[PDB]
Amino acid sequence: MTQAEIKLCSLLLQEHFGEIVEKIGVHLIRTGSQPLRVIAHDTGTSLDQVKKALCVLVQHNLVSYQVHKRGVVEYEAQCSRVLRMLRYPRYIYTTKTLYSDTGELIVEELLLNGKLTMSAVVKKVADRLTETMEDGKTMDYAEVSNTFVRLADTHFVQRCPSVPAPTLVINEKDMYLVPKLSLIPDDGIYWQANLDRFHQHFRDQAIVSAVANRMDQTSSEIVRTMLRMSEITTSSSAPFTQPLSSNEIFRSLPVGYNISKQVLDQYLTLLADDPLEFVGKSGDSGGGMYVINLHKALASLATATLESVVQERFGSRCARIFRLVLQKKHIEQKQVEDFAMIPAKEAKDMLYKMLSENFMSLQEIPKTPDHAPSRTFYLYTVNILSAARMLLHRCYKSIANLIERRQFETKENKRLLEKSQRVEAIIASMQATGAEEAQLQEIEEMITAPERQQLETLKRNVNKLDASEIQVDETIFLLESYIECTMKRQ
Amino acid sequence: PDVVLKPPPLFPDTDYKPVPLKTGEGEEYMLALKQELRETMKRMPYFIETPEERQDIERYSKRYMKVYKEEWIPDWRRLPREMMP
Amino acid sequence: VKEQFRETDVAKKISHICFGMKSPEEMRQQAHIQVVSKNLYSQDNQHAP
Amino acid sequence: DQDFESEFVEVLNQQCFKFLQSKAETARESKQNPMIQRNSSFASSHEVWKYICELGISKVELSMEDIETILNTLIYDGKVEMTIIAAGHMKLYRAVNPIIPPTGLVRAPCGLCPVFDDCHEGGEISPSNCIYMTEWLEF
Numbered sequence A: 001m002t003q004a005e006i007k008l009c010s011l012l013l014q015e016h017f018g019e020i021v022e023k024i025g026v027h028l029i030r031t032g033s034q035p036l037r038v039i040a041h042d043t044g045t046s047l048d049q050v051k052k053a054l055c056v057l058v059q060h061n062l063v064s065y066q067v068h069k070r071g072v073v074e075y076e077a078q079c080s081r082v083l084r085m086l087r088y089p090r091y092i093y094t095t096k097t098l099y100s101d102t103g104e105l106i107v108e109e110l111l112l113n114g115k116l117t118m119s120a121v122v123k124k125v126a127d128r129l130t131e132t133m134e135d136g137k138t139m140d141y142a143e144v145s146n147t148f149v150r151l152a153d154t155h156f157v158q159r160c161p162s163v164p165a166p167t168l169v170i171n172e173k174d175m176y177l178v179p180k181l182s183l184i185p186d187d188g189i190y191w192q193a194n195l196d197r198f199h200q201h202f203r204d205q206a207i208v209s210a211v212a213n214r215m216d217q218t219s220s221e222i223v224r225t226m227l228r229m230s231e232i233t234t235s236s237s238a239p240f241t242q243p244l245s246s247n248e249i250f251r252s253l254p255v256g257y258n259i260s261k262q263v264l265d266q267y268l269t270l271l272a273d274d275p276l277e278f279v280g281k282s283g284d285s286g287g288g289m290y291v292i293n294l295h296k297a298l299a300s301l302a303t304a305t306l307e308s309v310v311q312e313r314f315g316s317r318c319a320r321i322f323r324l325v326l327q328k329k330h331i332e333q334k335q336v337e338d339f340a341m342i343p344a345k346e347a348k349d350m351l352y353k354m355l356s357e358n359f360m361s362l363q364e365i366p367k368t369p370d371h372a373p374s375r376t377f378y379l380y381t382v383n384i385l386s387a388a389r390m391l392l393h394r395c396y397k398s399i400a401n402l403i404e405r406r407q408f409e410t411k412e413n414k415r416l417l418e419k420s421q422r423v424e425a426i427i428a429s430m431q432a433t434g435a436e437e438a439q440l441q442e443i444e445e446m447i448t449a450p451e452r453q454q455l456e457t458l459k460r461n462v463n464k465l466d467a468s469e470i471q472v473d474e475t476i477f478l479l480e481s482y483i484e485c486t487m488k489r490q
Numbered sequence B: 001p002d003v004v005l006k007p008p009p010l011f012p013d014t015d016y017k018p019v020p021l022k023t024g025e026g027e028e029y030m031l032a033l034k035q036e037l038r039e040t041m042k043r044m045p046y047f048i049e050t051p052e053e054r055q056d057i058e059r060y061s062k063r064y065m066k067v068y069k070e071e072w073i074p075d076w077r078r079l080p081r082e083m084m085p
Numbered sequence C: 001v002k003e004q005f006r007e008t009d010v011a012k013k014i015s016h017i018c019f020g021m022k023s024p025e026e027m028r029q030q031a032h033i034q035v036v037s038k039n040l041y042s043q044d045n046q047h048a049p
Numbered sequence D: 001d002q003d004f005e006s007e008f009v010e011v012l013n014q015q016c017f018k019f020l021q022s023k024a025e026t027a028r029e030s031k032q033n034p035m036i037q038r039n040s041s042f043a044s045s046h047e048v049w050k051y052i053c054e055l056g057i058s059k060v061e062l063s064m065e066d067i068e069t070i071l072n073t074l075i076y077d078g079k080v081e082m083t084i085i086a087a088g089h090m091k092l093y094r095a096v097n098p099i100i101p102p103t104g105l106v107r108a109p110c111g112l113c114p115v116f117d118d119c120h121e122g123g124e125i126s127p128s129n130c131i132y133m134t135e136w137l138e139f
């Protein structure tokens, strides 16, 4: 959408895919829909390579296409679907923390090939696992398909729109069937992982973790249970959870937890009578039902993220004033100090340093048709939406800078790297023939101290950058869920 | 009202130092997983590592150039019928 | 030692003129010196920059 | 006359936070299985007044407003919460923990960087010749 996301996805498709395909991919983000010939013309690339790039992008369900005025095919690249390649390791880890290596090696190949048949997934998983074992190379196809059905009925791997003129109009239905396998030819059925389910699971994990380290460890089990009964009936857009009662809650609680009825209602009313206001009770004199609020919790999460950012950058004394003015909306300059016991000089300094970085807004109240900056009233107020949206624009350029720094150090010590790796294969094949410790002192002293000390620092730097990348892209995910919920498609 | 003759440095030393990261066995697991995903998708047929290669004179050493050119089946059936390579 | 070929004098014409506005980043990239002082003349021996 | 001693004020604030944390310590080690009384094991302004009297720091301070304003500066920090109840209006104070840990956004040095607009590759200050990046990598 903006220059930051385009610059980020450019590198993301240059390091994941090739240069020729990433060129056409970035050229598809500047112009929404364009004919094939116009694209091949203005891009400057030949027709064959452009078709290769297009089919590569289509195979990974990254670009869409539609039929227009006469019979023309207009292609469109969506950047939001492209920017979700930094969470593949997190997706695989979330698949592996609940399931085992089965689901991990089933889903890790579904995201590297996009549209793929299950006969191919079972094939490749069975082959890799038989190659992994040493003496007993027996892998049941039924257990590989059992985890596949567990993904299918929990709505993790769905069916992409199948095949029902210049081209065919791809249509989607609600027929998520699982054709019965034949283990030792089923064509026209391709499966793909569902990302919004992963986003929902991450949202539930974040909510339960926040309510855990916030007040209690037990109430998080209760809310995670309340979030487990609604995985099937509730969707992402729906702001209010379907009503659930306590008698049904006491039915489904963990096996290793014995908590009685009235104390469970105690916990539920403590969750209702709470300033955080996550769960709300609508009941009677007799009984009632509880409803979990997702939007008013995501707002608190984004607010906490903003105060954490301002506290790590500016300071705790500064975040104190930030929270003070967030609580008391539209406060004036001389009345903020009688509340906050902070010296006026550096207080004004902090306020101006915050406002000059787009962290606060000032509203005008004049008493005249003229502005009259002298004869007017200034008020300080905080906007959460714009601040979250402006931090989201900073995270992307931060990730881009991290990626450029990681790619920068590799090409100055590159020939050194493939030269020290070429010496590795000289002795790796020699040790098979016969171990010579003289040929080992050859490689003991053939590499000099700075010739071996460069890889030592390069590996650590690459690890540090790739580990900071994930800690940064989890923040954009926590930040993009609050912006889309308030956004209402009219 | 004072005047500065020596310009400020291009890197003004920051206020505080950055924060150390969180580490668990899952963290290095995901790190190695990303490091292998990048290397494997770099070694995939979808990754085009062949922009174009130019060769001026022909040599006799044609034995050490047996590169296996297996494209993935494009599956033209579930694909725009207009685009036909 | 051998001399490398070089064009004698680059003579070209002007085809067309394009109008555009620069960014502060490109402005700093093109700029040479950064003025921070307001004193025009130094109060020393003679008029000197 | 309104006295100001920032050192004294913030050390009083730290001592009050430690005292409320110790009350939370005693409440959590007590652990009466019916935990309405555990969350109700608060410390009102009238007991932090007794704590002020047992402090022995400086007696030129009127208890009620000073302690309630210090607890206000504390709720502005985001460390404790207050709740008032009309019985007579009694203010109770509870110790709350932070909601989420510090984000991974700021752990990268690009979040602390004051020069963020000028940062661009191909010219002046950039991620290649950044001093902050190198100082982060070396450590």
Ligand code: SF4
Pocket: A398, A401, D109, D110, D111, D113, D114, D115, D116, D119, D120, D125, D126, D127, D128, D130, D131, D132, D133
């Ligand atoms: S590369 Fe360095 S100076 Fe530039 S924005 Fe990133 S952290 Fe800041």
